[PDB]
Amino acid sequence: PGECSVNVIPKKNLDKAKFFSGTWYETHYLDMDPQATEKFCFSFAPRESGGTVKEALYHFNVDSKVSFYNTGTGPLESNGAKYTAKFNTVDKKGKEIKPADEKYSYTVTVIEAAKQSALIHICLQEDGKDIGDLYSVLNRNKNALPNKKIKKALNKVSLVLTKFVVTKDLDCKYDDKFLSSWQK
């Protein structure tokens, strides 16, 4: 199965204005498929208004030296820390170059946030069925280590940080202006 993890708990009372602002950098990630070993850098700029999330996504494939740009949009759950989005493909100037494929979606759960750190989980789906998932440690600073509360949250779901890929050890290239200028 490409079954998504159980026991993924949304943070209680996430500060929305703080989390859904600025740019987040992935510092550590754990793809739950052990054979998924392509190296990636990830950053994004999530925004929220009227119960709808609109986020700009940036990935960089370290192996192939190719970047790609996406935007995602979807309703925020009443718990305020989980959303399911559909995504399109845009160029670096933000113009759509491929429309959203209706059969795909992803569900982001914000498990924990503390200081400059966060822990999220993403369940990818096709036609509403699980096709894979990943845990991501985020920071406002690319080079920073996570707050201990992020580790505490990992421990509750029987994960340890040492299992994660460390992003700062990769030769990343970022488009920071794409994210900085999001919804400007």
Ligand code: HEM
């Ligand atoms: C460090 C964290 C992450 C890593 C390492 C990662 C890795 C990947 C990989 C391996 C792919 C497949 C690319 C390909 O098929 O060539 C991908 C695609 C994608 N991911 Fe991520 N991901 C991360 C976090 C996220 C997050 C947090 C989101 C949403 C908020 C997200 C949304 C997407 C989307 C929309 C695609 C496009 C799939 C496609 O075009 O077929 N990812 N990512």
